[PDB]
Design an enzyme around this catalytic site. Sequence first.
Site, short mmCIF file in Angstrom:
data_model
loop_
_atom_site.label_atom_id
_atom_site.label_comp_id
_atom_site.label_asym_id
_atom_site.label_seq_id
_atom_site.Cartn_x
_atom_site.Cartn_y
_atom_site.Cartn_z
N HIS E 202 0.74 -1.26 0.00
CA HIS E 202 0.00 0.00 0.00
C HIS E 202 0.76 1.30 0.00
N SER E 206 0.06 -1.03 -6.49
CA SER E 206 0.41 -2.16 -7.31
C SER E 206 1.23 -1.76 -8.50
N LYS E 228 -13.48 -9.00 -10.67
CA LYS E 228 -12.46 -9.75 -11.38
C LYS E 228 -11.90 -10.85 -10.47
N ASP E 229 -11.76 -10.58 -9.17
CA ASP E 229 -11.27 -11.61 -8.26
C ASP E 229 -12.31 -12.67 -7.93
N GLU E 272 6.23 -34.25 -0.86
CA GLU E 272 5.01 -33.89 -1.60
C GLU E 272 5.47 -33.14 -2.84
C1 HEM Z 1 0.91 -15.81 2.28
C2 HEM Z 1 1.48 -15.61 0.97
C3 HEM Z 1 1.06 -14.57 0.19
C4 HEM Z 1 -0.18 -13.95 0.11
C5 HEM Z 1 -1.49 -14.41 0.72
C6 HEM Z 1 0.12 -12.71 -0.67
C7 HEM Z 1 -0.80 -11.74 -0.91
C8 HEM Z 1 -0.60 -10.66 -1.74
C9 HEM Z 1 -1.68 -9.88 -2.26
C10 HEM Z 1 -3.16 -10.03 -2.00
C11 HEM Z 1 -1.14 -9.07 -3.13
C12 HEM Z 1 -1.90 -8.04 -3.89
C13 HEM Z 1 -2.47 -8.47 -5.23
C14 HEM Z 1 -1.41 -8.95 -6.20
O1 HEM Z 1 -0.74 -8.09 -6.80
O2 HEM Z 1 -1.25 -10.19 -6.34
C15 HEM Z 1 0.27 -9.31 -3.15
C16 HEM Z 1 1.16 -8.62 -3.89
C17 HEM Z 1 2.50 -8.91 -3.93
N1 HEM Z 1 3.08 -10.02 -3.34
FE1 HEM Z 1 2.26 -11.36 -2.27
N2 HEM Z 1 1.43 -12.67 -1.18
C18 HEM Z 1 1.99 -13.84 -0.72
C19 HEM Z 1 3.26 -14.28 -0.99
C20 HEM Z 1 4.18 -13.60 -1.66
C21 HEM Z 1 5.44 -14.12 -2.00
C22 HEM Z 1 5.96 -15.50 -1.70
C23 HEM Z 1 6.09 -13.14 -2.60
C24 HEM Z 1 7.45 -13.08 -2.91
C25 HEM Z 1 8.32 -14.21 -3.48
C26 HEM Z 1 5.10 -12.10 -2.86
C27 HEM Z 1 5.29 -10.95 -3.61
C28 HEM Z 1 4.38 -9.95 -3.76
C29 HEM Z 1 4.67 -8.69 -4.40
C30 HEM Z 1 6.02 -8.28 -5.01
C31 HEM Z 1 3.51 -8.00 -4.52
C32 HEM Z 1 3.32 -6.77 -5.37
C33 HEM Z 1 2.73 -7.27 -6.68
C34 HEM Z 1 2.69 -6.22 -7.77
O3 HEM Z 1 3.76 -5.82 -8.26
O4 HEM Z 1 1.59 -5.78 -8.14
N3 HEM Z 1 3.93 -12.38 -2.21
N4 HEM Z 1 0.59 -10.37 -2.37
C1 HEM Z 2 -1.05 -22.72 6.26
C2 HEM Z 2 -2.36 -23.39 6.06
C3 HEM Z 2 -2.32 -24.74 6.24
C4 HEM Z 2 -1.57 -25.59 5.45
C5 HEM Z 2 -0.56 -25.23 4.35
C6 HEM Z 2 -1.90 -26.92 6.01
C7 HEM Z 2 -1.38 -28.05 5.46
C8 HEM Z 2 -1.56 -29.31 5.96
C9 HEM Z 2 -1.03 -30.50 5.32
C10 HEM Z 2 -0.11 -30.50 4.07
C11 HEM Z 2 -1.55 -31.52 5.99
C12 HEM Z 2 -1.39 -32.97 5.70
C13 HEM Z 2 -2.61 -33.30 4.87
C14 HEM Z 2 -2.63 -34.75 4.43
O1 HEM Z 2 -2.05 -35.04 3.36
O2 HEM Z 2 -3.22 -35.59 5.17
C15 HEM Z 2 -2.37 -30.95 7.01
C16 HEM Z 2 -3.06 -31.68 7.90
C17 HEM Z 2 -3.63 -31.17 9.01
N1 HEM Z 2 -3.71 -29.83 9.30
FE1 HEM Z 2 -3.18 -28.37 8.19
N2 HEM Z 2 -2.66 -26.90 7.18
C18 HEM Z 2 -2.93 -25.56 7.36
C19 HEM Z 2 -3.67 -25.05 8.42
C20 HEM Z 2 -4.19 -25.82 9.43
C21 HEM Z 2 -4.61 -25.33 10.75
C22 HEM Z 2 -4.48 -23.92 11.35
C23 HEM Z 2 -5.19 -26.39 11.36
C24 HEM Z 2 -6.09 -26.44 12.42
C25 HEM Z 2 -6.54 -25.24 13.24
C26 HEM Z 2 -4.76 -27.52 10.62
C27 HEM Z 2 -4.84 -28.74 11.15
C28 HEM Z 2 -4.35 -29.85 10.54
C29 HEM Z 2 -4.60 -31.22 11.06
C30 HEM Z 2 -5.35 -31.65 12.31
C31 HEM Z 2 -4.09 -32.04 10.10
C32 HEM Z 2 -3.82 -33.53 10.24
C33 HEM Z 2 -4.89 -34.56 9.87
C34 HEM Z 2 -5.15 -34.61 8.39
O3 HEM Z 2 -4.18 -34.75 7.62
O4 HEM Z 2 -6.33 -34.51 7.99
N3 HEM Z 2 -4.15 -27.20 9.42
N4 HEM Z 2 -2.31 -29.59 7.05
C1 LIG Z 3 -7.78 -10.55 -0.60
C2 LIG Z 3 -8.48 -9.67 -1.66
C3 LIG Z 3 -9.83 -9.70 -1.83
C4 LIG Z 3 -10.68 -10.47 -1.14
C5 LIG Z 3 -12.22 -10.65 -1.19
C6 LIG Z 3 -12.50 -11.69 -0.03
C7 LIG Z 3 -13.00 -9.25 -0.94
C8 LIG Z 3 -12.81 -8.65 0.50
C9 LIG Z 3 -14.57 -9.38 -1.18
C10 LIG Z 3 -15.04 -10.27 -2.37
C11 LIG Z 3 -14.14 -11.51 -2.53
O1 LIG Z 3 -14.61 -12.64 -2.49
C12 LIG Z 3 -12.62 -11.25 -2.61
C13 LIG Z 3 -11.94 -12.60 -3.06
C14 LIG Z 3 -7.75 -8.84 -2.43
C15 LIG Z 3 -6.25 -8.65 -2.39
C16 LIG Z 3 -5.72 -7.47 -3.21
C17 LIG Z 3 -5.04 -6.44 -2.53
O2 LIG Z 3 -4.89 -6.50 -1.18
C18 LIG Z 3 -4.52 -5.33 -3.22
CL1 LIG Z 3 -3.68 -4.09 -2.24
C19 LIG Z 3 -4.67 -5.23 -4.66
C20 LIG Z 3 -4.09 -3.99 -5.39
C21 LIG Z 3 -5.37 -6.28 -5.37
C22 LIG Z 3 -5.58 -6.25 -6.86
O3 LIG Z 3 -6.16 -7.12 -7.51
C23 LIG Z 3 -5.88 -7.40 -4.63
O4 LIG Z 3 -6.55 -8.41 -5.28
#
Ligand code: HEM
Ligand code: HEM
Ligand SMILES: CC(/C=C/[C@@]1(C)[C@H](C)CCC(=O)[C@@H]1C)=C\Cc1c(O)c(Cl)c(C)c(C=O)c1O
Lengths: 241, 61, 49, 101, 380, 108, 81, 98
Positions: E202, E206, E228-229, E272
């Site tokens: 922010h 973007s 769009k999303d 995996e």
């Molecule tokens: C929990 C993981 C992540 C979530 C949920 C997340 C979420 C976001 C969101 C919602 C945006 C705004 C919309 C967009 O432009 O896509 C964003 C932008 C961005 N994210 Fe992430 N992000 C994640 C991981 C990462 C990772 C792994 C990288 C870096 C290797 C990354 C790099 C960026 C950058 C550079 C922007 C700006 C994009 C632009 O130039 O418009 N994000 N991210």
């Molecule tokens: C970052 C988001 C999350 C990722 C990436 C994730 C990923 C995973 C993965 C890869 C497994 C193994 C699945 C399988 O092949 O059986 C798994 C299992 C599980 N995760 Fe998560 N998890 C997430 C969040 C959560 C959270 C916060 C909870 C509960 C509050 C949760 C509870 C568990 C439990 C109880 C299992 C084991 C039993 C099963 O495999 O069904 N996970 N999770």
């Molecule tokens: C996580 C999200 C949107 C989420 C929902 C949940 C809305 C709050 C309501 C309707 C929906 O279902 C969307 C998926 C948007 C993330 C997100 C951002 O944060 C920002 Cl800074 C930008 C510039 C974009 C551009 O595309 C974006 O997609």
Amino acid sequence: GELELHPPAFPWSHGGPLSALDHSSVRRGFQVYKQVCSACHSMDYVAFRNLIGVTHTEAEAKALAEEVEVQDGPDENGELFMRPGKISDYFPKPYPNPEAARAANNGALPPDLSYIVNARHGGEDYVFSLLTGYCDPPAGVVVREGLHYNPYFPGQAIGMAPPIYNEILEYDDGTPATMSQIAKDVCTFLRWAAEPEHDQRKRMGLKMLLISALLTSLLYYMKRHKWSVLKSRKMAYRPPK
Amino acid sequence: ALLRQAYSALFRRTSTFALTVVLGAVLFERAFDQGADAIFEHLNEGKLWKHIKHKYEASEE
Amino acid sequence: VHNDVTVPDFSAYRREDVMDATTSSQTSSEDRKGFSYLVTATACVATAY
Amino acid sequence: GRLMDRIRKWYYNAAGFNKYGLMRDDTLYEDDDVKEALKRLPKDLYNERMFRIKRALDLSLKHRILPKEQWVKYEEDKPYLEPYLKEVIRERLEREAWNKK
Amino acid sequence: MAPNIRKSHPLLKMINNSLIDLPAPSNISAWWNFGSLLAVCLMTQILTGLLLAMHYTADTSLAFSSVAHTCRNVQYGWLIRNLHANGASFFFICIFLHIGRGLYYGSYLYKETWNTGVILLLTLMATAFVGYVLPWGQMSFWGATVITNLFSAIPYIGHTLVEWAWGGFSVDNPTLTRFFALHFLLPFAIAGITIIHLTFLHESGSNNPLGISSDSDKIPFHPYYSFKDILGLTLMLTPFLTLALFSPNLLGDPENFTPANPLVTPPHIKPEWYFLFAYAILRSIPNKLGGVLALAASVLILFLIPFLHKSKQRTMTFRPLSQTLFWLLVANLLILTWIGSQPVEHPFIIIGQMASLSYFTILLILFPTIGTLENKMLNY
Amino acid sequence: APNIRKSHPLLKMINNSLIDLPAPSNISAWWNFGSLLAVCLMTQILTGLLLAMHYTADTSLAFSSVAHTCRNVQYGWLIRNLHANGASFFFICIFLHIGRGLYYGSYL
Amino acid sequence: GIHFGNLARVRHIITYSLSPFEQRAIPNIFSDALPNVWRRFSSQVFKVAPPFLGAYLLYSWGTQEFERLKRKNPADYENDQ
Amino acid sequence: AAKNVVTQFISSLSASADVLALSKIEIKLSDIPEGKNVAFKWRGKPLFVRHRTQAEINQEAEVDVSKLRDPQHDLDRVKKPEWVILVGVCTHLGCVPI
Ligand code: HEM
Ligand code: HEM
Ligand SMILES: CC(/C=C/[C@@]1(C)[C@H](C)CCC(=O)[C@@H]1C)=C\Cc1c(O)c(Cl)c(C)c(C=O)c1O
Ligand code: HEC
Ligand code: HEM
Ligand code: HEM
Ligand SMILES: CC(/C=C/[C@@]1(C)[C@H](C)CCC(=O)[C@@H]1C)=C\Cc1c(O)c(Cl)c(C)c(C=O)c1O
Ligand SMILES: CC(/C=C/[C@@]1(C)[C@H](C)CCC(=O)[C@@H]1C)=C\Cc1c(O)c(Cl)c(C)c(C=O)c1O
Ligand SMILES: CCCCCCCCO[C@@H]1O[C@H](CO)[C@@H](O)[C@H](O)[C@H]1O
Ligand code: FES
């Protein structure tokens, strides 16, 4: 050294994305397991109640479970004691623990068949080919005593002597119990066992496609609708002179 | 003209719009459900317990 | 000057009903909106389900 | 030997920023020097560069390009910022060096 | 005062000031929809996760059967388990495109937004890893054994670091319970950092495909990008569900259907799918510490990207040479994944070392070089 | 710019909510419960995790896991204590935090 | 905070737009849309495809070559007795 | 005070008091026929006991003890040339060698 024969792909009635399991073939599969495999193979995650409404009537299921002795207790003197089975019991383990299971199979451990079709590459296609694929070892290959030659099993030397042979049992539904007829059935069972949802999971998948189809469309329009404002947009640069 | 009839009666007032979505979702459900189940069961004739059922269900003993 | 400025031609994009420069766009409005709002009403119903 | 020319002109059409009507200089990423340079652009040269860009973005949202005719030509590309920017970077190196002394 | 209660309210001013009145470039392509999808996954994972946690039992003698029970008995448990496990995959698919986009469009020039991203990636990885260990199957175990064993490469404090990790002197119950704790926790830390990621963003706004200021043309996030999303969601959702509903195990290793055996390491032990590429590199360097370092660097190298930028332009839209190199790199990873899924035998071993060597060169040497070159061809 | 305490998107927060924060010069000790309440939270959370790493949610094992956590886990007994008693001091503190609010019309 | 009003300085640009209810959602699907879908495909398929097609071969090769090394070479047992 | 409270909490992760430090294991060399390897549960990780044929006892003693990552001669690794005993744990990252 690292050579192996891979099983082919049979056309199971439940192979289709929209094809349910043939519950008739599963009822038989069960019989096969119940009267042949359950002699060495445990099925710890399935229970008599699970058969209800899938392959058996409630009456049947209950009687099927009363045919077994189940240890319970303790009683009032803290003494264990036998009792007839209830629909809530799990299929009977044929050995108390692996140690003893090996002890009566030449040190071989017959795996629990609950999740088998998903724990072996090939699933039912594998299990099948292996049951029906027993044969003589080729020139130059000596099979250790106590073991049997099966080309489908990795190593070709398996510890399970061919479990099924024609008429080895009798399907009370009147189906010619040939060997592959059996194998085909028991495999269909080992699938239902490894994942009872199967049928419902696919009925859902159907509903999912239709709604998904309909919805992606609706929203594609709405997205274009709004955006049109920007899509058609026209701009011109009219600097003053 | 339904589009106009509909717009004027249903879609215009943001409150009637909601009633339509609810009332509609209800109808849509009940029907979409039967239809799909109907399509699915048909695609699997004689394989479901719904079919086999009669052979043991109060038929013997 | 602002007198030489005119709105380009959006015929390439106009809906069939408001393509003619001499017909009240007002008659076809009720539809043009009813249809677009019907798509949204459905999406809502499909999602609600 | 017109090699470097042959190449440059090739790369120029390869890039394709001209399909949007942008001059090689409208594409420079705006770091600190570029930003300063742009503030030194004469009113008109700045307002034109702006439209060119606002027009290229509009193209990009639409997923189109200019009809072949309007494409910028390798030899008609005016490097409108290049000389300003070089001075900005020259004024800067002086400061930088003078503060180490 | 403030007329509308959308711009004044200490809270709604936030929902509104960060997703409704937010200034967005009018030309962001589909490659920008991954942000939200990544976000949506997080909420979906977390939700399905809790639902599962309400039936799991972190204990060696009960882990495997609890999950099994969760499926065969818990109403819709089977569906929830699926969704959770396959979400893990679609989460990674999405994160990988999210990254590529950044790479291809120089979004990494947004350093902090980027660095927090990398942190996010590492966290998601650690999470997905320990999740995969909970069902206590064959991979679960041997995975737990190898990864915690990685610290053993760190001299001195190494062999000790492993002791905590396990809580004993060999993987066992303590490891499984402190893993469930860890899994339960991390996702939130993810959600937390995600907030920061988006906050740094922010400050700047973007980026957009052409990589030139879009101040001359911004648009309100809503309804342009919200719609769009929504659409971008219903698209990812279709194959995610087509997969999870029609072919559940397509994406997952089957070794995990066999309760852990402390005495037998399965011969076909792979991680995996989303970790293969690293697993591939680890198996390249035929030296304990080298392989470990190469592995670490295989992800940590992302921190260096911002600094290896030489182009005078921001994106690769107008850089045909960088493009080729960029796509050559993608195919490069695509290979390591295949390699990671094959045995440690010729011709694989050689193809392997190659792709790795290839990976690190395209990033540390080529890109920055071709970049400089390109600058000269523009006459800069 | 100038200081990196007021500009930085993060430190501008640690600084703008606990270091440059405008505080009445006459708040009494009844105002110290806010922080104590806060501190508890972090302490509870921390000792909690430590325990979650040895607990086992299952009827046939819950009781004995806590018991084991104490008799076997190094300093487990101390951690168990701190967590359980923190629950109390947390409430004590929250109660005074409330009274204060009531007695001084902070509820306004 | 608020960024709508600070962004940048712009002069002399007129833009005309039409409500969504006056125009078509997906217009000129044939005369305009598809032509560009093709336009784009063409320009890009030679930067993208190549390296993929390349890795493909390397995949097919290394695969088939690993299979070949499984089969036996008669020249090993044509002397045995 | 701080250092001390961390000291404690950090060792709350170490091995508990219930974690043992157990004995040995007897094995009859008549269950392990010549030309085979066998695995026994022991002190956590596997334990191998291999009855080598002399067909092998030669290879193992006929190698450049100088071209080894870890230089050791088959003789001072085992006592009876027909019985090689070892902890079945790869020294890399802990998997069980096949
Ligand atoms: C929990 C993981 C992540 C979530 C949920 C997340 C979420 C976001 C969101 C919602 C945006 C705004 C919309 C967009 O432009 O896509 C964003 C932008 C961005 N994210 Fe992430 N992000 C994640 C991981 C990462 C990772 C792994 C990288 C870096 C290797 C990354 C790099 C960026 C950058 C550079 C922007 C700006 C994009 C632009 O130039 O418009 N994000 N991210
Ligand atoms: C970052 C988001 C999350 C990722 C990436 C994730 C990923 C995973 C993965 C890869 C497994 C193994 C699945 C399988 O092949 O059986 C798994 C299992 C599980 N995760 Fe998560 N998890 C997430 C969040 C959560 C959270 C916060 C909870 C509960 C509050 C949760 C509870 C568990 C439990 C109880 C299992 C084991 C039993 C099963 O495999 O069904 N996970 N999770
Ligand atoms: C996580 C999200 C949107 C989420 C929902 C949940 C809305 C709050 C309501 C309707 C929906 O279902 C969307 C998926 C948007 C993330 C997100 C951002 O944060 C920002 Cl800074 C930008 C510039 C974009 C551009 O595309 C974006 O997609
Ligand atoms: C005499 C006990 C016995 C009977 C009866 C028997 N099996 Fe087995 N089965 C075994 C043994 C022993 C093994 C272990 C083989 C090994 O690993 O060496 C085994 C293994 C298997 C395996 C594959 C194991 C693997 O590693 O791939 C399957 C599948 C299997 N049996 C299915 C069946 C089926 C189906 C039937 C009933 C139609 C059946 N068995 C009846 C003893 C038996
Ligand atoms: C998790 C519980 C809570 C925490 C950690 C917490 C924390 C805080 C903190 C740190 C402050 C600032 C310093 C102070 O004045 O004490 C504060 C102020 C305040 N809190 Fe709480 N609080 C909590 C619960 C509550 C409760 C239960 C009430 C209401 C019944 C309450 C009412 C207030 C009010 C009114 C203020 C303003 C105090 C003033 O007038 O100066 N708080 N709180
Ligand atoms: C809101 C802060 C917290 C409060 C009020 C709190 C309170 C309590 C209470 C009253 C008990 C019973 C104590 C007893 O044995 O008498 C307890 C136990 C426990 N709590 Fe918490 N807790 C908090 C945070 C946490 C968190 C977040 C975790 C772990 C991450 C946790 C894990 C546990 C566990 C495992 C026990 C059960 C075993 C035991 O009693 O030692 N707690 N907690
Ligand atoms: C891919 C990888 C490790 C990845 C980590 C350790 C990153 C290097 C840092 C952040 C993380 O938390 C990941 C889990 C290790 C390779 C790897 C595995 O993943 C898994 Cl499951 C197994 C069973 C093995 C067996 O040999 C393996 O070598
Ligand atoms: C939670 C806290 C302080 C916490 C610590 C943790 C500091 C961040 C560093 C030094 C410490 O040890 C404090 C206890 C303060 C709470 C807090 C507040 O939020 C606010 Cl708005 C005010 C006006 C006060 C006034 O006294 C306050 O104490
Ligand atoms: C975005 C895609 C949403 C798909 C929604 C489909 C809803 C699943 O519908 C399910 O069908 C089952 C069998 O018909 C029933 O037993 C379940 O109760 C019902 O919820
Ligand atoms: S080769 Fe890595 S653990 Fe054995």
